[PDB]
């Protein structure tokens, strides 16, 4: 399989302006007829090269003439000797029922549905399957009326008929030109929740959610969130929906979470269905997120699309930034920012050090599905956020307005988006463009000095980005670096220099620079890189007392949480070294005290309290070390939890009882209290065992909602409490017919600290609720084991590696995209010790030898073995 390179982009030799599709639908054998109006832009001898994969070609006509001047090659139909404008007609056959990879047209339970992003439409018919080719689609669907009473495609329903033999048909027309990745089709039998939203200028939009029969009672939250998304995008970005109908269909078999197909989003049912006894606060808020996100693509991705797939972040980074703003405006911004920072530092940084490292705009791709990444998404968004930080909201919105004004109806690049922001704002972003083209995490080192003679504070800030596997050359970035200076009472000290105020977002543009501040009337405690103002690693020599001070006094809630993380980091590192020498945990008392103080601050927002009392995950802890010892990290996290539980026992139980809530509400104050209560529970679970067991079984049995019940179950598993087995059995007894709810149970099993966890995981491949044919199940058991039980996955005997190789040997042929998600923990081998490396290298070499090795895995494996 061949790499493609961004620098090789060229305008296509042919365009298609309109396509009329006919599906004669059948699970075994669907016949597709595609009539496309085309225009040659290139030279008369440049043939039309159409992409196609696993298609059975039946005929080819040009202006109704059977065409003889063509040939099929690997992945393509190449057609010669064409006129400048012509109608192309292709008839071909495909087989949805055989599509296990879930790309193109496939079967989800009894339904048929599509997934076309990125290059899945070529699995449906021969086409210019590239997103710079935009066309007006009309879609006629013909099918068995009893099996497929609902037949859906993009746009408006314009025609319909009955036929003999129990068949019917419907035709759809989508008036907005689109790249084919935005094509969708769905056929099946559903319950439909119907509502409307009226836009600020008065357009009434029919809203339709299609769910499996019986699930209508789990749909209203998603409907509500769609309405909230549409409203917010009007209030914040001034953007209105542009069609008269908005459809979402929830399907159980889907590789990703959701898809923004124009006017017909297709969603993994995981991010639609909720009821208070099946879904947690977190599920409610994820559903909010994803509904929002796909909706926001309607403009940032659909009305303006991507010129080529290397520009993916233009839509994903920007649309992530939007879904974060949405969540943040509606919920707690601090909690949003916090969790988003956890993800950047604990997962994205890891990827940006891995063999798969890439800039947010990749320069080289073998399999484009491997680039739907933390980097393109999460770091993409941080890059957009830095633009926001440099421009301020008002110029940023001007920038958005120019972007649309210029590019509505077309396919754009990252550089276009940057240029619009620069032209509207008058802020120069030529240096800043470097963030699109350079991989890896910059490291920013800060040194300070206070001069009591001059009342000056001097910061010397330096930056470097270490080389990455993909890039030997690195250069300085334009880093927005926000600071605040605190005096000894915790008040902010005005930043100024030579009589004049100074913006507190510093422009760190060089390898090294000095900034001098005047009238600093006391030696300051600095808050640095406030709000995570740039996606960088900060190197500064805090004292513990600076950090506890910031925990008490910092103006932004983010800086308080962040300071607590810097406090813990030190002692996490200490205790990992200790663990490797067989020593128990050591923690100075004033650390426990900072946490006690948080527990008892009556004025702190319980949302914030709760995040501070949520210890860094093992993945966040991993990023503190050059070489990861996953066992020591895990055991230290446990011991820290044990220590704090013991030291803060009375306080924890007090706060636990005080945040009791009789009523269950999906409301931000209630969620916050409850998130704090269950954080308290989690520590208590690791205290005195009799009390722990009582508390946890009691919460599980008395919970009136899944959030409280799952937090108990999860604590029973984590702390291996006596009630554990009985509670897990009850959950299975009650919930086994429900895959989505079971996924929770599988994750708990897979991430158990128990000694025989691997053995249990293997057994669960045969569980009544598991199947290898559903990505959700695969991800919830196997993926959670490899990615989220690093202590077991990295067992010194290598049994974790072998187990994954077995699973990937199946998935490489069944569903390579899920395979490629799942291989990721293996391609991190260079972060681990030599002996684990040798075993992971051997596993990868075994996979490299598979017959019919997929491209998706080949790309990752060769990079990892290089």
Three-state DSSP class for residue 180: helix
565 interacts with, out of Zn ion, ligand BES, Na ion, none, CB within 5 to 8 A per kind: Na ion
Q: Kindly identify the residues of this chain, within the stretch 191-250, that bind ligand BES according to CB under 6 A.
A: none
Check residue 89 for interaction with ligand BES (CB under 6 A): no
274 interacts with, out of ligand BES, Na ion, Zn ion, none, CB within 5 to 8 A per kind: none
Question: H or E stretch including 717?
Answer: helix 706-718
Dump strand ranges (E) for 179-319: 185-188, 191-198, 204-211, 245-251, 258-259, 264-268, 304-306
Q: Looking at 53, 119, 208, 294, which residue is catalytic? A: 294
Contacts of 116 (CB under 8 A, 6+ apart): 104, 124, 180, 181, 182, 183, 184, 261
- Between 98 and 137, how does the x/- string for binding to ligand BES read (CB under 6 A)? -------------------xx-------------------
Residue 457 gets which letter from DSSP? E
The residue among 260 and 623 lying less far from ligand BES, judged by its C-beta, is 260
Of 469, 556, 486, 477, the residue nearest 524 (C-alpha): 486
Nearest approach in angstroms of CB 92 to Zn ion is 30
Three-state DSSP class for residue 398: helix
Three-state DSSP class for residue 41: coil
Nearest approach in angstroms of CB 655 to ligand BES is 32
The residue among 179 and 442 lying less far from ligand BES, judged by its C-beta, is 179
Scanning 184-192, 380-388, 566-574, 611-619 for contacts with Na ion by CB under 5 A, the matching segment is 566-574
Annotated binding site: 117, 257-261, 293, 297, 316
The residue among 323 and 557 lying less far from Zn ion, judged by its C-beta, is 323
Nearest approach in angstroms of CB 229 to Zn ion is 13
Of 221, 201, 190, the residue nearest 283 (C-alpha): 221
The residue among 295 and 542 lying less far from Zn ion, judged by its C-beta, is 295
15 interacts with, out of ligand BES, Na ion, Zn ion, none, CB within 5 to 8 A per kind: Na ion
Distance, CA of 360 to CA of 45 (rounded, Å): 37
User: Could you say which of 270, 297, 379, 831 contacts Na ion (CB under 5 A)?
Assistant: 297
Nearest approach in angstroms of CB 3 to Zn ion is 24
Question: H or E stretch including 840?
Answer: helix 834-848
Alpha-carbon torsion (595, 597, 600, 602), positive or negative: negative
Nearest approach in angstroms of CB 372 to ligand BES is 4
Question: H or E stretch including 418?
Answer: helix 414-425
Dump strand ranges (E) for 502-605: 505-508, 512-517, 525-528, 537-539
Q: Kindly identify the residues of this chain, within the stretch 412-451, that bind Na ion according to CB under 5 A.
A: 448
Query: Number of residues in contact with ligand BES, rule: CB under 6 A?
Result: 18
Strands 500-501 and 496-497: antiparallel
Nearest approach in angstroms of CB 381 to ligand BES is 9
Q: What are phi and psi of 576, to 5 degrees?
A: -65, -45
Residue 38 gets which letter from DSSP? E
The residue among 316 and 629 lying less far from Zn ion, judged by its C-beta, is 316
Of 717, 687, 675, 683, the residue nearest 700 (C-alpha): 717
Q: Which residues of 286-302 are buried (b: 16+ CB within 10 A; e: fewer)?
A: bbbbbbbbbbbbbbbbb
Check residue 258 for interaction with ligand BES (CB under 6 A): yes
Annotated binding site for substrate: 117, 257-261
Distance, CA of 535 to CA of 374 (rounded, Å): 13
Q: What are phi and psi of 552, to 5 degrees?
A: -80, -45
The residue among 297 and 779 lying less far from Na ion, judged by its C-beta, is 297
498: left (phi over 0), alpha (psi -120 to 50) or beta: left
Distance, CA of 344 to CA of 341 (rounded, Å): 5
Q: Kindly identify the residues of this chain, within the stretch 718-747, that bind ligand BES according to CB under 6 A.
A: none
448 interacts with, out of Na ion, ligand BES, Zn ion, none, CB within 5 to 8 A per kind: Na ion
Partnered with residue 264 across adjacent β-strands are 247
Partnered with residue 9 across adjacent β-strands are none
The residue among 173 and 813 lying less far from Na ion, judged by its C-beta, is 173
- Between 331 and 370, how does the x/- string for binding to ligand BES read (CB under 6 A)? --------------------------------------x-
Scanning 10-18, 50-58, 313-321, 488-496 for contacts with Zn ion by CB under 5 A, the matching segment is 313-321
Nearest approach in angstroms of CB 294 to ligand BES is 6
Q: Kindly identify the residues of this chain, within the stretch 377-436, that bind ligand BES according to CB under 6 A.
A: 377
| Relative orientation angle of helices 649-658 and 668-685, to the nearest 10 degrees | 150
Q: What are phi and psi of 296, to 5 degrees?
A: -70, -20
Q: How far is CA 61 from the centre of its chain?
A: 43
The residue among 53 and 316 lying less far from ligand BES, judged by its C-beta, is 316
Nearest approach in angstroms of CB 365 to ligand BES is 13
Terminal-to-terminal C-alpha distance of the chain: 17
Check residue 576 for interaction with ligand BES (CB under 6 A): no
Nearest approach in angstroms of CB 735 to ligand BES is 24
116 interacts with, out of Zn ion, ligand BES, Na ion, none, CB within 5 to 8 A per kind: none
Check residue 15 for interaction with Na ion (CB under 5 A): yes
Distance, CA of 609 to CA of 115 (rounded, Å): 42
Check residue 260 for interaction with ligand BES (CB under 6 A): yes
Annotated binding site for Zn(2+): 293, 297, 316
The residue among 369 and 751 lying less far from ligand BES, judged by its C-beta, is 369
Q: Kindly identify the residues of this chain, within the stretch 281-300, that bind ligand BES according to CB under 6 A.
A: 289-290, 293-294, 297
Of 81, 23, 27, 32, the residue nearest 52 (C-alpha): 32
Helices (H), 125-272: 220-237
* Active-site annotation holds for 235: no
Residue nearest to ligand BES (CB): 257
The percent of the chain in helix, strand and coil, each rounded to the nearest 5, is 45, 20, 35
Nearest approach in angstroms of CB 653 to Na ion is 29
Residue 300 gets which letter from DSSP? B
- Between 264 and 303, how does the x/- string for binding to Zn ion read (CB under 5 A)? ----------------------------------------
The CA-based angle 5-10-16, given to 5 degrees, is 125
Distance, CA of 736 to CA of 767 (rounded, Å): 9
- Between 307 and 326, how does the x/- string for binding to ligand BES read (CB under 6 A)? ---------x---x--x---
The residue among 22 and 319 lying less far from Zn ion, judged by its C-beta, is 319
User: Could you say which of 19, 32, 134, 721 contacts Na ion (CB under 5 A)?
Assistant: 134
Note the residues at the interface with Na ion (CB under 5 A).
15, 133-134, 297, 301-302, 333, 448, 562, 565-566
Note the residues at the interface with ligand BES (CB under 6 A).
117-118, 256-260, 289-290, 293-294, 297, 316, 320, 323, 369, 372, 377
What are the catalytic residues? 294
Note the residues at the interface with Zn ion (CB under 5 A).
316, 319
């Amino acid at each position: 399989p061949q790499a493609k390179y961004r620098h090789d982009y060229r305008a296509p030799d042919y365009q298609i302006t309109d396509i009329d599709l006919t599906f004669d639908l059948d699970a075994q054998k669907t016949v597709v007829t595609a009539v496309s109006q085309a225009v040659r832009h290139g030279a008369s001898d440049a043939p039309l090269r159409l992409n196609g994969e696993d298609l059975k070609l039946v005929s080819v006509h040009i202006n109704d003439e059977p065409w003889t001047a063509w040939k099929e090659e690997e992945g393509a139909l190449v057609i010669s000797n064409l006129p400048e404008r012509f109608t192309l007609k292709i008839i071909n056959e495909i087989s949805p029922a055989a599509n296990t990879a879930l790309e193109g047209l496939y079967q989800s339970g009894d339904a048929l549905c599509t997934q076309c992003e990125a290059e899945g439409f070529r699995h449906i018919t021969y086409y210019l399957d590239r997103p710079d080719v935009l066309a007006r689609f009309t879609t006629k669907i013909i099918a068995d009326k009893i099996k497929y009473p609902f037949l859906l495609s993009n746009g408006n329903r314009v025609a319909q008929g009955e036929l003999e033999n129990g068949r019917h048909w419907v035709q759809w027309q989508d008036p907005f030109p689109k790249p084919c990745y935005l094509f969708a089709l769905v056929a099946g039998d559903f319950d439909v929740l119907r509502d409307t939203f009226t836009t600020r200028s008065g357009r009434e939009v029919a809203l339709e959610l299609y769910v499996d029969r019986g699930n209508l009672d789990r749909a209203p939250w998603a409907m509500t969130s769609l309405k909230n998304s549409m409203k917010w995008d009007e209030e914040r970005f001034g953007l209105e929906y542009d069609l008269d109908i908005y459809m979402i269909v929830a399907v159980d078999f889907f590789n990703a979470g959701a898809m923004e197909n124009k006017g017909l989003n297709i969603f993994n049912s995981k991010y639609v269905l909720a009821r208070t006894d099946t879904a947690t606060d977190k599920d409610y808020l994820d559903i909010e997120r994803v509904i929002g996100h796909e909706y926001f693509h309607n403009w940032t991705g659909n009305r303006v699309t991507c010129r080529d797939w290397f520009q993916l972040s233009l839509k994903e980074g920007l649309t992530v930034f939007r879904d974060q703003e949405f969540s943040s405006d509606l919920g707690s911004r601090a909690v949003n920012r916090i969790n988003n920072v956890r993800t950047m530092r604990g997962l994205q940084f890891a990827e940006d050090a891995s063999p798969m490292a890439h800039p947010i705009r990749p320069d080289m791709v073998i399999e484009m599905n491997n680039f739907y990444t933390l980097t393109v998404y999460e770091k993409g968004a941080e890059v957009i956020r830095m633009i926001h930080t440099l421009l301020g909201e008002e110029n940023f919105q001007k920038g958005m307005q120019l972007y649309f004004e210029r590019h509505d109806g077309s396919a754009a690049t990252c550089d276009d988006f940057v240029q619009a922001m620069e032209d509207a704002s008058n802020v120069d972003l030529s240096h800043f463009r470097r963030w699109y083209s350079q991989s890896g995490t910059p490291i920013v080192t800060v040194k300070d000095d206070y001069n009591p003679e001059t009342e000056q504070y001097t910061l010397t800030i330096s930056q470097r980005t270490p080389a990455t596997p993909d890039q030997a050359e690195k250069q300085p970035l334009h880093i927005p670096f926000a600071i605040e200076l605190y005096d000894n009472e915790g008040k902010v000290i005005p930043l100024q220099k030579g009589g004049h105020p100074v913006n507190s977002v510093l422009n760190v543009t060089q390898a090294e620079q000095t900034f001098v501040f005047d009238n600093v009337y006391f030696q300051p405690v600095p808050a640095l890189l406030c709000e995570f103002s740039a996606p960088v690693k900060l190197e500064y020599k805090w004292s513990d007392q600076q950090l506890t001070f910031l925990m008490r006094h910092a103006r932004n809630d983010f800086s308080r949480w962040d300071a607590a993380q810097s406090l813990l980091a030190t002692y996490i590192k200490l205790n990992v070294a200790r663990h490797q020498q067989g020593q128990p945990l050591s923690l100075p008392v004033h650390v426990a005290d900072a946490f006690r103080a948080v527990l008892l601050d009556e004025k702190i927002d319980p949302a914030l309290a709760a995040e501070i009392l949520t210890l860094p995950s093992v993945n966040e802890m991993a990023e503190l070390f050059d070489i990861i010892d996953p066992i020591a990290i895990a055991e230290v996290r446990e011991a820290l939890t044990r220590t704090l539980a013991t030291e803060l026992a009375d306080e924890l139980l007090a706060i636990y009882n005080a945040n009791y809530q009789s009523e269950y509400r999906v409301e931000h104050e209630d969620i916050a209290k409850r998130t704090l209560r269950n954080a308290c529970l989690r520590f208590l679970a690791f205290g005195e065992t009799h009390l722990a067991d009582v508390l946890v079984s009691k919460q599980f049995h008395e919970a009136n909602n899944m959030t409280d019940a799952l937090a108990a179950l999860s604590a029973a598993v984590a702390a291996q409490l006596p009630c554990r087995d009985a509670l897990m059995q009850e959950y299975d007894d009650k919930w086994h017919q429900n895959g989505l709810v079971m996924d929770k149970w599988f994750i708990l099993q897979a991430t158990s600290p128990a000694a025989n966890v691997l053995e249990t995981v293997r057994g669960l491949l045969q569980h009544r609720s598991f199947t290898m044919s559903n990505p959700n199940r695969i991800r919830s058991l196997i993926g959670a084991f490899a990615g989220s039980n690093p202590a077991a996955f990295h067992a010194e005997d290598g049994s974790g590696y072998l187990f994954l190789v077995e699973m990937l040997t199946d998935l490489n042929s069944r569903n390579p995209q899920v395979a490629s998600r799942l291989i990721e923990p293996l391609i991190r081998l260079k972060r681990y010790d030599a002996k684990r490396q040798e075993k992971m290298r051997a596993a990868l070499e075994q996979l490299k030898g598979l017959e019919n090795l997929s491209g998706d895995l080949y790309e990752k494996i060769t990079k990892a073995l290089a």
